[PDB]
Design a protein around this ligand. Sequence first.
Ligand SMILES: CN(C)c1ccc2c(-c3cc(C(=O)NCCOCCOCCCCNS(C)(=O)=O)ccc3C(=O)O)c3ccc(=[N+](C)C)cc-3oc2c1
Length: 293
Amino acid sequence: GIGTGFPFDPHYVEVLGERMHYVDVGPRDGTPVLFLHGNPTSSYVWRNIIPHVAPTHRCIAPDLIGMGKSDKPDLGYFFDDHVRFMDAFIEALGLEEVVLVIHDWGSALGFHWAKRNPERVKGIAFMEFIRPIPTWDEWPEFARETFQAFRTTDVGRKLIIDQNVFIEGTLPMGVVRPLTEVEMDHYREPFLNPVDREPLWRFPNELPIAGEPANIVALVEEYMDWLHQSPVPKLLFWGTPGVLIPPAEAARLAKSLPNCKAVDIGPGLNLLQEDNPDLIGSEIARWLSTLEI
Ligand SMILES: CN(C)c1ccc2c(-c3cc(C(=O)NCCOCCOCCCCNS(C)(=O)=O)ccc3C(=O)O)c3ccc(=[N+](C)C)cc-3oc2c1
């Protein structure tokens, strides 16, 4: 059985006047491994992968601001808000050099931070990450109209804020195998009140699709350009058919990104962690030995 529980002790750090929650396990010395979750998850999405890395490496898994057990300030939760909070989280924890394990919107946070701090990143494991979607044709047909509806302030907010569709429908449709009730309740816990769902709606409205928003498209194209040239060790997980990263894209990236290892995880949509956590965790563990950390 795939683990459903969250046994990690809570850790907190005051950041920009707001308390943020993070998982911190593993030995204290050596290079830490920073796990960055996306939408609409939390450090809970790393629950079955950390146990493969925690025996030999420090594992830090924060909850993004307004998500998980972190505080819920009255912000718009634009990507720029998450950048400032994640920049200040990393400094508040005194992290010097790190290995990144990033997913979904956390990957945009990881890549944007690694582009600005390339000396402090010894490797990047990433899966179902954010890239420029040139046209709506590059978005999966089965989820296309709903995400077009998500990116509006009337129908989009009604679905996500008022009806919580992103948790009750979009999240299960990002996973191939079925999610138990206990797993669903963990993902529901930070969003029982419609107020807390603002990041669940701003995130898909920040997706770089068809040139909008222009600022996010430029930002993501920048770190994609850095990724195509930098020699930082890269580990990419992908599944079939995926959502953000289709198999043909993963094959292209596996040849064009320097020092990159691609790992097929089998069937998979967006939350690859939930469809094959053992392969992801045990491959990250094996890959960390090939780094000079
Ligand atoms: C439990 N079961 C499997 C479902 C499945 C679907 C639904 C749906 C549902 C969702 C969708 C839907 O979410 N489509 C789109 C998902 O496909 C995206 C998958 O990749 C994205 C992963 C996340 C990526 N994160 S990022 C980068 O974006 O930040 C479409 C139609 C329906 C429908 O019903 O007619 C419900 C709709 C309304 C509703 N009421 C008003 C309370 C309840 C719904 O309940 C559902 C339950």
